[PDB]
């Protein structure tokens, strides 16, 4: 019937990298022709038939486009299949990277929402939000213009594990929509819960004198493999492996060094091989500095 | 007397051949009544039996929501299993889920099930008390440790004892005439000569419901359970089932062998003898 077009290892590919288009049809990656969607019904490359794969390497801006393939069908009225599913090759690294930040924050309760805003002093027409590792096409929004910046609000939610991970975003100017900016700095989005909260304590305790060093200890009866300590409002985020103590409590001890000043802290448990889903936050603990 | 409800779901990865595919199917006894196909155009839980076609839109709205949620959870589970087993993102893999319940004809709970397999072997399963999990390998004990910290068994036990056995009761009433009927097996025998000293007696059971049935051969009144050939019960296609059993008999000794058919639709078991 209709072939399956796929890009490996991903359709969002940086300029100078490599991507391979394969057209699986009739139980084989057999010979096929390619069609970009400005010329729907005549094949690109002057009718070139591809033997196995189409390896584009190195990737140029010319490779950016919206592709469909037809597989070879010898014993058929016309010699070829129906058009495949479309695949958009997006070439990154053509403009300065925009900015990406999450509202209200990157730690999202399960089932709730979060806003990912991309903005730039470059005036982009479209913004693209993309989670790393998934082969779903990135989400596109039109860039709103406001006092000399282009921006767009991506709504992520209601929060599930399939939506947690590393997000980057991109911009495209008006006439090269498949040519994307350099990726913004990555932003990790974490779903919290519904794993039971750990407990957070301080030793010697929560009140410390200036210049003196305190440590925070996260503990749980559940077998978390790592613990994450978050200062409230701050970007001070660390992670530590859990250790089985003498009873089967799992614990990690976060030292804070000399206390310039102290805020409130929370801690989360996370499990092995799943780093973007954390437990519910611990009870808050405020460290006061005299 | 006893009745059962089961949901079977299959999630399959196929890199370069298509996007991951999810198929779920619902059974009461031996009768399928719903299906969901992630690759179908509907994108909805579909009726597959006449007696459930009459549930309200809110039923189909709600079942579709949770089966689509399952179809998306188990497709992220395929990705996690690659990390658990350090497996290539290039190979294709299977994730199977079985869930359901038994009730007696007294009407209430006897047993619940909620188990998983990865690439065709056991992964994790809720055991009989509905309070703990059995993990088949080191990877499933990570899932067990997660599910303990999330108090999952407590939620699935509540669903099992509540929404599930009382949905089963509604289905049994809505379709009792098809689900609680018993169509008896029509029987006959065939005779094929293998050799000059060898013959094959085959005994047929056709058109019976439910699928459970017993075919036993007897020579001068004791069983030949390792000498009889038994085939898997097969669906007729109309909601009934078929099965046959065969003996290899010394030629001229057909008189010796009797076939015995037991089934709930039969008042008494049948004992059948061959003649040319």
């Amino acid at each position: 019937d209709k072939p399956f077009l796929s890009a490996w290892p991903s359709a969002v590919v940086p300029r100078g990298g490599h991507v391979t288009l394969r057209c699986h049809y009739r139980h084989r990656f057999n010979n096929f022709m390619l069609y970009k969607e400005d010329r729907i019904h005549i094949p690109i490359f002057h009718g070139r038939i591809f033997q196995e794969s189409f390896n584009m390497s190195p990737v140029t801006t010319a490779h950016a486009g919206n592709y469909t393939c037809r597989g070879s069908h010898p014993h058929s009225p016309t010699g070829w299949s129906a058009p495949s599913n479309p695949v958009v090759i997006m070439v990154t690294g053509n403009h300065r990277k925009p900015s990406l930040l999450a509202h209200p924050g990157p730690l999202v309760k399960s089932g709730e929402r979060v806003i990912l805003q991309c903005w730039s002093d470059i005036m982009f027409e479209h913004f693209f939000l993309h989670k790393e590792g998934i082969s779903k096409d990135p989400s596109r929004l039109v860039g709103q213009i406001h006092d000399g910046v282009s921006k767009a609000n991506f709504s992520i939610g209601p929060m599930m594990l399939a939506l947690a991970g590393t997000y980057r975003c991109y911009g495209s100017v008006t006439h090269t929509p498949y040519q994307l900016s350099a990726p913004s700095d990555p932003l990790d989005i974490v779903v919290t819960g519904p794993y039971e909260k750990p407990s957070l304590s301080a030793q010697p305790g929560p009140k410390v004198q200036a210049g003196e060093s305190v440590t925070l200890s996260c503990s749980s009866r559940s077998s978390y493999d790592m613990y994450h300590l978050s200062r409230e409002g701050g970007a001070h985020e660390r992670r530590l492996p859990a250790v089985r103590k003498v009873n089967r409590t799992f614990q990690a001890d976060f030292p804070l060094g000399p206390a310039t000043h102290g805020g409130t802290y929370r801690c989360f448990g996370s499990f092995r091989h799943s780093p973007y889903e954390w437990s519910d936050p611990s009870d808050p603990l405020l460290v006061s500095v005299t | 007397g006893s009745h059962s409800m089961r949901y079977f779901s299959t999630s399959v990865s196929r890199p370069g051949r298509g996007e991951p595919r999810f198929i779920a199917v619902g059974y009461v006894d031996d009768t399928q009544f719903v299906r969901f196909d992630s690759d179908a155009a509907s994108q909805r839980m579909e009726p597959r039996a006449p007696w459930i076609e009459q549930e309200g839109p809110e039923y189909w709205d709600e079942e579709t929501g949770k089966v689509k949620a399952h179809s998306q959870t188990d497709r992220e589970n395929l990705r996690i299993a690659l990390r658990y087993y350090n497996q290539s993102e290039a190979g294709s893999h299977t994730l199977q889920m079985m869930f359901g319940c038994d009730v007696g004809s007294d009407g209430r709970f006897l047993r619940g099930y909620h188990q998983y397999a990865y690439d065709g072997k056991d992964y994790i399963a809720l055991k009989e008390d509905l309070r703990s999990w059995t993990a088949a390998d080191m990877a499933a004990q990570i899932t067990k440790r997660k599910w303990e910290a999330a108090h999952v068994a407590e939620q699935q036990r509540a669903y099992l004892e509540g929404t599930c056995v009382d949905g089963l009761r509604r289905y049994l009433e809505n379709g009792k005439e098809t689900l609680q009927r018993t169509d008896p097996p029509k029987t006959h025998m065939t005779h094929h000569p293998i050799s000059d000293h060898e013959a094959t007696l085959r005994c047929w059971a056709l058109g019976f419901y439910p699928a459970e049935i017993t075919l036993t051969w007897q020579r001068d009144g004791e069983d030949q359970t390792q000498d009889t050939e038994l085939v898997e019960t097969r669906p007729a296609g109309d909601g009934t089932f078929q099965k046959w059993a065969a003996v290899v008999v010394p030629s001229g000794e057909e008189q010796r062998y009797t076939c015995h058919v037991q089934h709930e639709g039969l008042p008494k078991p049948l004992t059948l003898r061959w003649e040319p």
């Binding site: 594990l161 | 949901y7 079942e63 089966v67 399952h70 959870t73 990570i142 997660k146 699935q156 929404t163």
Partner: peptide, 8 residues
């Protein structure tokens, strides 16, 4: 009735 499902 179709159940809840949880992540691995």
């Amino acid at each position: 009735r179709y159940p809840l499902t949880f992540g691995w």
